[model samples]
Target: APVVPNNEYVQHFKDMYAKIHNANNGYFSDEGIPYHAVETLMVEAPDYGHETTSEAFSYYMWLEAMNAKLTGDFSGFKKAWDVTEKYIIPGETDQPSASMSNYDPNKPATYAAEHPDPSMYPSQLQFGAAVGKDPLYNELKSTYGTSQVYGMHWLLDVDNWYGFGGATSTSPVYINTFQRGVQESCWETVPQPCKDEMKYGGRNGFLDLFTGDSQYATQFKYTNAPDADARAVQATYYAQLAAKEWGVDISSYVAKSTKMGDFLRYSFFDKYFRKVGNSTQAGTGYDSAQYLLNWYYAWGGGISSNWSWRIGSSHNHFGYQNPMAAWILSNTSDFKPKSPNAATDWNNSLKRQIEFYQWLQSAEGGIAGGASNSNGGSYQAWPAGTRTFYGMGYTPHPVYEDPGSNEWFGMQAWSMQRVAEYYYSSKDPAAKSLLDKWAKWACANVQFDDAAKKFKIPAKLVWTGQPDTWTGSYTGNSNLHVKVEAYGEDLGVAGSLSNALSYYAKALESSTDAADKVAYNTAKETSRKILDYLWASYQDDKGIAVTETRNDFKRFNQSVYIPSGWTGKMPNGDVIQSGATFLSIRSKYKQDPSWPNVEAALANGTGVDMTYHRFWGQSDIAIAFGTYGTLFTD
Candidate 1:
């Protein structure tokens, strides 16, 4: 069935399309279509912000192309392809060109000048290349010498980057680019150019990249971090997708994927996530006899590094990797771990993660942040003034034994979307039950006010004092306060909200129970309102999406004090000044106010802080708008 477009959805999509397309000049910008088009935007002129690698552009185009297809706007798709081609350089031979490696957008012209050899700039097969193949990519073949559009060596090298702990290291740009590329490839078609690229360009063909001594050696090298593991699973899944969708042979890739799964299952999951001990034994705040289970750890620096046992008590718990793992397990047809009940085990693992959330879910429906012993005995200790157990040796924290603490909208929304994806695919009763609880909670807690039509997303929710014991109930802690303030419209939050809306709609459609359907409908409606508020109030004059709404409230665990000698300067030595201290929900800024003027002034251009403009932020904007089609059709 085709998607039946809602009038509002259609109009909003069109408006955002024009806004984003017009923001970038069809080529590429290091700033990546700023949230606000200010005259003096803060940037690292000669350095990359988040869109460090060319693959970032690939992801943008992929999403743009997908959105265009959904909206039946071929012109938009063509424009995205044009931009992709302009940035990509076709390979001279099979090897990855040096230009492709360690790409610096600011140094491209100079780099090209110094390295006159065409091979220095390796070719990239944009995911857009596979969008209903035309002779355009084939035409490039005559000029570039081969029909292969993809840079084979680039893919192998990036995959190797993941295996080398690139994700955890300082410069994680390459690893992230690789991860986004694989994510885009999962939805792409196998064009002839891609087929040839894989076959001829790879050293021993495509299989060699996944097998041989080099392949096995690379696999054993990196630390087994959860994000890296999710990415490995994602890349392997793309290979599987290529084989299944494009009729390419990726049996070797499947074997590699299976090995990674086995490693994670035994090495990481078994040791860190499967253990069950009493809360007293773990030395957390929960009652001594309370049975505490292990949830996914947010960070595991490979097998060689300490496997820190952190629980998903926070919103960004696990860095949203467990959901990625669940996504791969649910979607793949040929891959599984070594367990006799691989599918069941994976399903149960997801269920347990959701259960952890359910236990921590507040009466207001907000989810807690995360749990760790490093921050001291209580969850609020670190966030509050006391850092008593700061230097104590790492001790494991029990899962879901504490009251639901601070609520971060971005993290909460991200978890909801992932859990929704798992539910939509698996239709597990347990998943559905959890979603029901979450949907109701979101409606009560996270959604914007209906009569006011204002965005009142609570930046934080905390218990005033320490509770005596945890029986998975927040009832004992009545001093819960929801602090409403300005939060930046980060990609994670927007994308997750979009996914949540879509999933809720689907849940409503499939629901047989009247009560469940009503709850799902309320969630869907609330999500729609939030999106409406964003589209109507958050965009700048040029319609470029803004990142955040600033408020005077000090962010938890964030410092307003800039370190001495740590001069706040952009890459180009542009001095950045802080803007308005805090944004009020009912302030003039919330209404018709100068946007880019307010946003441009606040920045350091460091990837950690949300800049006025961002690539992932823009990507999420489009994704948030684009995912509506998925609901109607699916």
Candidate 2:
């Protein structure tokens, strides 16, 4: 809530909100003609919801507030503000008022005129800039000027820290228009000294080991010093792509990640997998297989409920299963495990992974519960639900059906959906059978909350048709609902709906069962209605508005925002507040919302997605360009 200093802050709020509303709504107009009647009705809607969160209520309230504000409805703003204030952190103690200087979570009365230090805080401006809210956006014209630390970035960061090396830290990969721009801008803004270090940091020098360039060789030299045979395998893979893409030989970089790949295989299989025969730890290498298996499950398996592990644990072994990385190794024309060597590695790896999941499945075929050893069996534990710690970033330990919990489930589902796609694409009958079984089980077992409009696995085994021990408790307080909103920026609310839609579409293409087809159709419609509700809550003046409902008092705490409405409690017990409604609406309404003009810009060279500069910021653009020749076409 803006501090109305002698009513001065009210004008600022009104002006800022109005500017964003007009710009976004205008962009949303069909062609150029405005729908006067529709516009008028939208502007005149009355508030209908005393509480927000439900789609029907929030939409009416949002429109009514927007219309009231447009017509100089200060009273409406005051009413909205009153409800919103209840959601705020009460004082500035837990919020970042201006910058690092005044940003303290223990006191609210120390706000001072302090600007964010560009060197230490480059990503701060992005939150406001993405939706045109940054007051200092124009002042700081640097690349990293307006950056928001997105949830995907957090997920990826945690994954990388946990040793999933598929992601790049210096050059990040994002599937959205907003993130791609921010990543590129930030990459460009680094000082020349930092750029120099990136190039000459390790043994071979700074290079992208994945792309098979001089950098790849540098990485191989640094990470795999004494393994020539492993380097040979790595080089061979890189050589094939380098010769094909760059027209220049790059057997060295290929050799490096390849050597690393072999090391990855040995790290899990030889050292850890073979030792463990059953789920119990027997010897050294026994744990290796389980580790690798857990990694595969966390990275790829569709753990779509609250029973999954967090990102930093050994459970999240592999980063989001990079199919491209897998494809590169397998040399398969499609996404199937085709290359003989690649197939062997993956099959061995996947079988071990499956073994763990199988062990976790209850006698009645339901998933398990809890996050710790004391919680029960290894398969039954949701290891993400551990004691909270500071600076750990987002180390999830508690699993609930709230937003954060559901978002993780959606991500897992996305990963599993890919696995299913890979299996079906293989056209192997055995793989198809497995996929079918899993899909059928998923549709039947998981309980759908009609009231909350979310998918949940019942904690009671009686309801889940699974064993009681496997059924765990949930972190379901109304306050925790805000977590759903906090995570919306990255894990779009429509994700589950989109996944269901995709599943139905895919089933229509592949399945022969009439009953299955009907079920898929019904699921798809239900998903659409949920999507509608998500869209309705969106405000014309903000992006992806947070759900506006209060959690019950049991979940309330002054230190935390108590996942209600647009406020969420961070693991560190700090409250992060946002009122980005218009941005949220625009995102849901956009065609190919995640993939936008940025992709086209990259394809046309009108914009460059990733580039490299010299120590002195000079040439070598050709060499850098030649490195990625494999992934491009003429």
Best by TM-score: 1
lDDT of 2 at 268: 36
| Whole-model Cα lDDT of every candidate shown, in order | 0.36, 0.25
Error (Å) of candidate 2 at residue 43 is 35
Model 2: residues with Cα > 4 Å off, grouped in runs: 1-274, 277-287, 291-343, 354-412, 427-493, 527-543, 548-634
Q: How far in Å is the alpha carbon of 201 misplaced in model 1?
A: 39
Off by over 4 Å in 1: 1-321, 334-348, 373-407, 445-454, 463-495, 540-544, 547-611
> Model 1 compared with the native: what TM-score?
0.48
* Model 1 lDDT per residue over 1-634, tens place: 2343565655565676665566443323442322112222222210113223332343354455445444544444344334333322222222133212322211111000111121222223222210111112222234334322231011111112112222344222112111111111111111011112222212322222221223211111112234334434543453344344434454654554454443333212211111122111122121111111122221111122211111211112322334445556544667765444444545555544554454444444454443333222222234333211111111112222121213346556655665665566556565565567657655565545456544554444443322222343334223322344434444335555666767766756776888877776777767666667767667664443445543311221122221122222222222322221112211222232343443433333222223354443455555556556445532
- Summing lDDT over every window of 10 consecutive residues in candidate 1, give the lowest-scoring window: 106-115
Write candidate 2's Cα lDDT for 1-634 as tens digits: 2211233222323443343235454311221111111111011011101111111111122332333322333343233223322221012221122232221111211111111121222122111111101111122212223211100111111111111123243211111111111112211111111011223212222122111122222111011111112212322342343244434333333433342243233223211111232222222322323223121110100111111111111222111232223333444432222122444564555543333222223333222221211111122233343321110111122122222221333333433443443443344343333334434444443444456545432211221222122122222111111111122221132332234334433544556888757755554444344333433432234322332222221111112111123332222222233332221222211233323543444345453232111110010111111111111111
